[PDB]
Nucleic acid binder design. Structure first.
Lengths: 131, 1322
RNA sequence: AGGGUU
């Protein structure tokens, strides 16, 4: 049982082996689920791997895991679009994603950049709710 | 007017009428208007005309431009269409006289485009649609292809909108030069040829416009004529076929897109009609699949995921470019993220608020519509314009994601839908929403999906039938509860049902990874039924059924009436048994459970579960899984559908790595000969043919066109190696000596005894080489001997290349292993897989092989002990495989190496003096003649000893693996070199085999033309790829496409989809070169004539030509075969006591009487088998056998009384055949059924039929023209053997002119034998 | 219709 974990460290030392390792982690995943987050920090074989990372993010209520999952998805334009969609669907917080898109949307020449910037500004803009 | 059409036939064109009236155009005009049109194109009328050979004998051979008319054109198309409906060759007469076909074809085109409701009615133009569909589906016919080319080539693009054409030429700049070249060559044309060319180039695009206007004429709710519906249906069928074939798709796909047909269709009133447009909708979904199919139109390659994404990204990008530059009201919308903008939802949000004019303008900038002139309003609907832009740009899910969301079980919404699950009553007049099998497929996904869906539909239909049979028997009645008035063997009331697990989805999926449930039944039944229900095992599929009965208690059920209303059918769901629970709550030395309650844990389809849950949560639908009150089981052998579908899905999911030299041929395009051994780059120059040739004379005779040169001149020195060139007709033959295997002469190898013909040799030669080898083996041409010789040659030439053998039946496997046993193949290298009565002398199952190894290990370890003692080594302990290995290296190899050091590094005497193993071989050495001889004798002794230790090293695994299952795994993965199974087993076990790491290099198949397409493909992938490539080195297929095809339970799937077509047959049709075995050895030459006309040069082997047993006549019968005319008996010919249960009392009684006659003559009753083409007649002949023979001592029983279809691969000395039919020819018109029927007899064939009916059938003529060359009245010789086939008999020949005369004769003959003899069995 | 050591 321990041997599989030992093998995983060997896989960690190192594509198919990555599949065996990711399967070894997804076999269920506590701190290990966060570690998959490390896999998102490193590499994702396919949207499916990214989807699994997203599932882990969904599983943990706290915000950072979800942010990491979104990042994994991006790593270009399609990934950025997916991140934007997630932000639109996500009502959790505007700060982590705010800065992300800012630097992410600095590789665009025209229209969408000015228009995109305007859209970002629009998104940014009892008691507190009334204000 | 059946007497009218028939009298006309007799006068003007019928076969077997010496002199006919000359051609008269008015006959064609009269028949079309008064018989075909007036009867509303009645199928029976059209059948009669077609069967009477109207097309071949009247229509086409008298067709010319000067006589061509509407009636003439339509009549030809009706006949061709009917031939397709009946699955008989449709194009032969056109191929015979091709001269006027181009004129005819062009005018079919004109007629198809004729103004709606004009000269041609909509039905008539539907007939033309179907005819043209057949044409496009028949481009393999040169005559048809040469006409269709101009309709579907690049020049057809002049039908494109001018802006779209330019867009495409800019997209693929290399296209423009070819476009220019076309325009140039067009200049060289005279004005009429140019006009004809332009009309042909525009045909399909103009046909689309005609369809669109027909479609628009369909009202939303007001009554609609069925002719409009059916026209639209057949049109989409045509679109699908054009789109699903690359040569027709290549340029037409762009044309279809430019027309926006698909958007028109999805917004149409017709699809909105829930009943009328249902079939149209399902056909539409198929078309949508292909218009968006993942293939590059120009390269023909499948599109990657990246390429798909790029295509979608580029579309959005160009839409945003146009948005930014020219749209102000929607300018803010352009600035949107491409992903956010792309979903259907986002696109509707952005373009939905815009005006019709603006959307038209947007579309125009994308070259989708012509420019909207300034200040003009668009003529298009806003919903059209919106759906045009939205559907074009929205996100699409891939074909794989689409497949992975399909439930593997049919629901109540599928099982009774006869558009996709037709009954056996399907006439072929309407079309179905089904895939078609012909020659080509777009990609592997297309190929696999067509087979997936076709397999899926038939299984669902079978399941529905089973449910109807078992649920009806239960008699569900109202009590608002249900009470069951009857009981069923295969279905039980559910006592309890509970979903017990809904597992979380895997990453990238929206369905639970696993859904399980507990279902309880109360086995208050007969112990036989209790046992069967307890006989359920893991992976068994059951169906969960919900009835809410409609009838009060006691209400009679009528099976003729709609089943669903009869029992109140509400839901059907599938499930798969995990296991029965025991009284400790464990999923099942099986226990004896107490009481009558039983609970099974089952798997539910997770996709179906999610859909049902989604439906419940979103739409308030009731929870289906709280309603089940019936569970139905099935026969295990008929219930593998779910496993097969899963395997196919897995294959689609994997990279499907087949050999690169196979991929194109499998898909049916490219050079059909490119996998022949002569074209393989890795063709082997020198091969050891071992024991293939019996002598150098046999070898020389085996290669007629070659010059044989032997490496040794001495005729006494002439196994053989043969080297093939790369003058070039020269073969270099090297005789060589089999290495001595020890001092026991009985350990010399078994040898082949079959003197293979030069053709059989070509097959064996091909099978030994890399690549695709296809062998066509007519009845009795030695398919099995060819097979085992190939297997043997591969075994010896390439040790540790593993061979996979796949057949259709266990009988073929029995035959292969029987012949394998007579050859030099070690039985430790043999393995047979299966889910069976042992029929071979040895047991090659996992069980038999584990047992052999265990018993052989014991004997060999005892030899090691004897060797130890003969060497004077002390030690009382027995050896294991482990210590035997140590012993070999330490005691045996050492002694041998020392010995070789002395005598091979030199007298005859020292070979024997220093030989280290004299005492061990005392029970068996040297001759003292020459060094070379005795040295090799010594070498052979060492090989003998080494073989003992080689085996023990292989057998060590049985010491490391205790269980029989692990031991069998070792044999399967490692030890066996020859592994055999049925295609059925291969399909079921593929998953387990891949998981085990099963590996193999070569595949040989038998009965290949009896195996379904997809079940032929699956055995190619029972292993993982190796370094990115398939390990497969050889593919040998042996079969006969001129005999019967795979069995399709519901023949509607054959009629519409050609689902019976094997891969073997498709490959022959595609043009893959075949080796055609040409000499049969099991039947008389005279009998062989009845079917050898069907094959290429099929003659007879010498022993058939020369042995007395084939020239000895059949006692009491003048002829060795006869066709016997049987008229009516008591006013009846064919009869039908139950629907489709065809019988013929006159024929049956005659057949039985003949069987009795033969028995009373002293025939071995077992050497006679009785065959017929219908099950109804089979039971009737059996009925008469029991009621006329009964307890008769003088009369035995025939070996079998069965149908021709159930007698495939079987034979007897004498066959009595009843053809039954008197009204219509029926399924014997299939020449393959004919050939099988003509070849079941070794020595005697006697056929009883209404001769006139079958004589009139054109396809059956080559057989029946031979059969009617002899009398149609049975010639008997009742006082009779050693009489020869040709010699005039030395007895009286009496002629029986009918059945009653025969039944009289046999009665009198028997009553004379009862008085004069008395036999005694008790 | 399937087998193993402080």
């Amino acid at each position: 049982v321990m041997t599989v974990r030992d093998f995983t460290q060997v896989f960690d030392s190192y594509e198919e082996s990555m599949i065996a390792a990711k399967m070894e982690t997804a076999s269920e995943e506590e701190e290990d689920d966060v570690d998959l987050e490390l896999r998102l920090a490193r590499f994702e074989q396919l949207i499916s791997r990214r989807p699994l990372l997203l599932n882990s993010v969904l599983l943990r209520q706290n915000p950072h895991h979800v942010h990491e999952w979104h990042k994994r998805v991006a790593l270009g334009r399609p990934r950025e679009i997916i991140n934007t969609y997630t932000e639109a669907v996500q009502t959790v917080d505007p700060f982590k994603a705010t800065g992300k898109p800012h630097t992410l949307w600095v590789a665009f020449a025209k229209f969408y950049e000015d228009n995109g910037q305007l859209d970002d500004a629009r998104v940014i803009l009892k008691v507190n709710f009334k204000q | 007017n059946a007497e009218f059409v028939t009298q006309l036939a007799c006068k003007y064109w019928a076969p077997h009428i010496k002199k006919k009236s000359p051609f008269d155009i008015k006959v064609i005009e009269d028949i079309y208007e008064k018989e075909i049109v007036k009867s509303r194109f009645a199928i029976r009328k059209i059948m009669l005309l077609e069967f009477s050979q109207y097309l071949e004998n009247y229509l086409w051979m008298n067709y010319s431009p000067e006589v061509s008319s509407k009636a003439y054109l339509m009549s030809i198309c009706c006949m061709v269409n009917e031939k397709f409906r009946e699955n008989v060759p449709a194009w032969e007469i056109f191929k015979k006289k091709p001269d006027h076909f181009p004129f005819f074809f062009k005018h079919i085109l004109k007629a198809a485009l004729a103004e709606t409701d004009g000269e041609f009615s909509l039905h008539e133009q539907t007939v033309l649609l179907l005819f043209l569909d057949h044409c496009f589906n028949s481009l393999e016919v040169d005559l048809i292809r040469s006409q269709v080319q101009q309709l579907i080539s690049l020049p057809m693009w002049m039908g494109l909108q001018l802006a779209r054409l330019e867009l495409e030429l800019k997209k693929t700049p290399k296209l423009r030069k070819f476009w220019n070249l076309i325009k140039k060559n067009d200049e060289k044309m005279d004005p009429e040829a140019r006009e004809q060319a332009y009309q042909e180039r525009r045909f399909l695009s103009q046909l689309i416009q005609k369809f669109i206007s027909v479609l628009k004429s369909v009202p939303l709710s007001e009554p609609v004529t069925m002719d409009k519906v059916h026209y639209c249906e057949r049109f989409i069928e045509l679109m699908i076929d054009l789109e699903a074939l690359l040569p027709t798709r290549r340029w037409f796909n762009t044309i279809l897109d430019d027309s926006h047909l698909l958007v028109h269709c999805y917004l149409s009133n017709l699809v909105r009609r829930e009943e009328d447009g249902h079939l149209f909708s399902q056909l539409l979904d198929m078309l949508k699949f292909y218009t968006g199919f993942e293939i590059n139109d120009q390269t023909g390659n499948a599109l990657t995921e990246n390429e798909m994404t790029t295509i979608h990204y580029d579309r959005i990008t160009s839409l945003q470019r146009a948005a930014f530059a020219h749209f102000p009201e929607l300018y803010d919308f352009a600035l949107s993220n491409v992903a956010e903008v792309d979903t259907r939802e986002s696109l509707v949000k952005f373009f939905g608020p815009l005006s019709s004019n603006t959307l038209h303008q947007v579309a125009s900038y994308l070259c989708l519509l012509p420019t909207l002139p300034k200040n003009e309003d668009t003529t298009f609907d806003k919903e059209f314009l919106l759906e045009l832009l939205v559907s074009r740009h929205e996100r699409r899910i891939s074909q794989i994601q689409q497949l992975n969301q399909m439930p593997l079980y049919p629901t109540e919404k599928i099982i009774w839908d006869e558009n996709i699950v037709p009954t056996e009553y399907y006439s072929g007049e309407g079309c179905l929403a089904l895939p078609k099998l012909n020659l080509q497929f777009l990609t592997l996904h297309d190929y696999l999906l067509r087979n997936f869906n076709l397999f899926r539909l038939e299984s669902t239909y079978e399941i529905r039938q089973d449910i109807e049979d078992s649920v009806s028997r239960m008699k569900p009645w109202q009590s608002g509860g249900v009470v069951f008035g009857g009981w069923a063997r295969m279905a039980q009331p559910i006592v309890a049902f509970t979903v017990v697990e809904v597992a979380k989805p895997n990453i990238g999926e929206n369905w639970p990874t696993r859904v399980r449930a507990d279902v309880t039944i109360n086995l208050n039944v007969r112990d036989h039924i209790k046992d069967e229900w307890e006989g359920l095992r893991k992976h068994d599929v059951c169906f969960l059924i919900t009835v809410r009965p409609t009838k009060p208690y006691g209400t009679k059920f009528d099976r003729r009436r709609p089943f669903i209303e009869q029992v109140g059918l509400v839901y059907v769901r599938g499930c798969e048994i995990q296991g029965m629970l025991d009284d400790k709550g464990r999923v099942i030395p099986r226990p004896n459970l107490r009481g009558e309650s039983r609970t099974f844990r089952v798997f539910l389809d997770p996709n179906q579960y999610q859909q049902d849950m989604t439906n419940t949560i979103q739409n308030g639908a009731e929870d289906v899984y709280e309603t089940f009150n019936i569970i139905m089981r099935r026969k295990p052998k008929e219930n593998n559908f779910k496993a097969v579908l899963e395997t196919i899905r897995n294959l689609m999911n994997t990279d499907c790595v087949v050999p690169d030299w196979l991929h194109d041929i499998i898909l049916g395009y490219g050079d059909p000969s490119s996998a022949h051994y002569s074209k393989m780059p890795n063709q082997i120059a020198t091969l050891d043919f071992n024991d293939t040739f019996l002598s150098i004379e046999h070898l020389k005779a085996s290669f007629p066109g070659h010059n044989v040169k032997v490496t040794v001149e001495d005729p006494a020195l002439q196994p053989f190696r043969i080297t093939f060139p790369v003058e070039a007709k020269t073969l270099i033959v090297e005789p060589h000596v089999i290495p001595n295997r020890g001092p026991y002469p009985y350990n010399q190898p078994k040898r082949n005894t079959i003197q293979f013909t030069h053709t059989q040799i070509e097959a064996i030669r091909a099978g030994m080489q890399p690549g695709l080898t296809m062998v066509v083996g007519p009845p009795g041409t030695g398919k099995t001997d060819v097979a085992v010789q190939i297997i043997s040659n591969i075994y010896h030439n390439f040790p540790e290349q593993r061979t996979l053998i796949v057949t259709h039946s266990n009988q073929a496997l029995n035959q292969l292993f029987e012949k394998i046993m007579a050859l030099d193949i070690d039985e430790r290298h043999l393995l047979r897989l299966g889910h069976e009565e042992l029929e071979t002398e040895k047991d090659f199952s996992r069980y038999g092989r584990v047992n052999y190894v265990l018993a052989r290990r014991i004997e060999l370890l005892e030899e090691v002990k004897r060797l130890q003692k003969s060497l004077g080594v002390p030690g009382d302990a027995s050896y294991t495989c482990e210590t035997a290995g140590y012993f070999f290296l330490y005691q045996v190899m050492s002694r041998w190496e020392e010995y070789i050091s002395k005598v091979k590094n030199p007298d005859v005497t020292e070979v024997s003096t220093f030989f280290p193993f004299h005492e061990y071989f005392a029970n068996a050495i040297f001759k003292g003649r020459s060094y070379e001889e005795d040295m090799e004798i010594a070498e052979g002794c060492f090989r003998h000893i080494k073989k003992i230790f080689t085996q023990l090293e292989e057998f060590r695994a049985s010491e490391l693996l205790r269980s029989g299952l692990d031991r069998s795994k070792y044999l399967l993965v490692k030890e066996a070199k020859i592994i055999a199974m049925t295609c059925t087993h291969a399909a079921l076990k593929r998953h387990d085999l891949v998981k085990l790491g099963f590996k193999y290099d070569n595949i040989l198949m038998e009965e290949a033309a009896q195996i379904l397409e997809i079940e032929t493909f699956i055995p190619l992938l029972l292993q993982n790829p190796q370094d990115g490539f398939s390990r497969l080195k050889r593919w040998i297929m042996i079969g006969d496409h001129h005999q019967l095809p795979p069995v399709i339970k519901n023949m509607a799937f054959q009629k519409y989809s050609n689902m019976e077509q094997s891969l073997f047959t498709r490959f022959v049709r595609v043009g893959v070169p075949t080796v055609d075995l040409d000499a049969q050895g099991r039947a008389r030459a005279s009998l062989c004539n009845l079917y050898n006309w069907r094959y290429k040069n099929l003659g007879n082997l010498p022993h058939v030509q020369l042995l007395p047993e084939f020239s000895t006549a059949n006692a009491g019968l003048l002829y060795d075969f006869q066709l016997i005319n049987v008229e009516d008996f008591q006013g009846v010919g064919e009869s039908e006591p139950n629907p489709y249960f065809y019988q013929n009392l006159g024929e049956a009684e005659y057949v039985v009487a003949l069987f009795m006659y033969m028995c009373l003559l002293g025939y071995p009753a077992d050497k006679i088998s009785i065959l017929t083409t219908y099950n109804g007649q089979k039971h009737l002949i059996r009925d008469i056998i029991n009621r006329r023979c009964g307890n008769n001592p003088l009369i035995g029983r025939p070996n079998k009384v069965t149908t021709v279809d159930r007698f495939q691969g079987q034979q007897n000395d004498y066959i009595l055949l009843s053809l039954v039919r008197t009204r219509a020819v029926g399924h014997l018109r299939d020449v393959r059924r004919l050939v099988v029927a003509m070849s079941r007899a070794r020595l005697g064939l006697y056929i009883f039929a209404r001769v006139s009916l079958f004589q009139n059938c054109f396809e059956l003529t080559p057989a029946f023209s031979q059969l009617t060359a002899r009398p149609l009245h049975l010639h008997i010789i009742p006082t009779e053997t050693t009489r020869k086939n040709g010699e005039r008999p030395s007895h009286e020949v009496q002629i029986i002119k009918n059945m009653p005369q025969m039944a009289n004769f046999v009665y009198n003959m028997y009553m004379h034998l009862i008085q004069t003899t008395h036999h005694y069995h008790q």
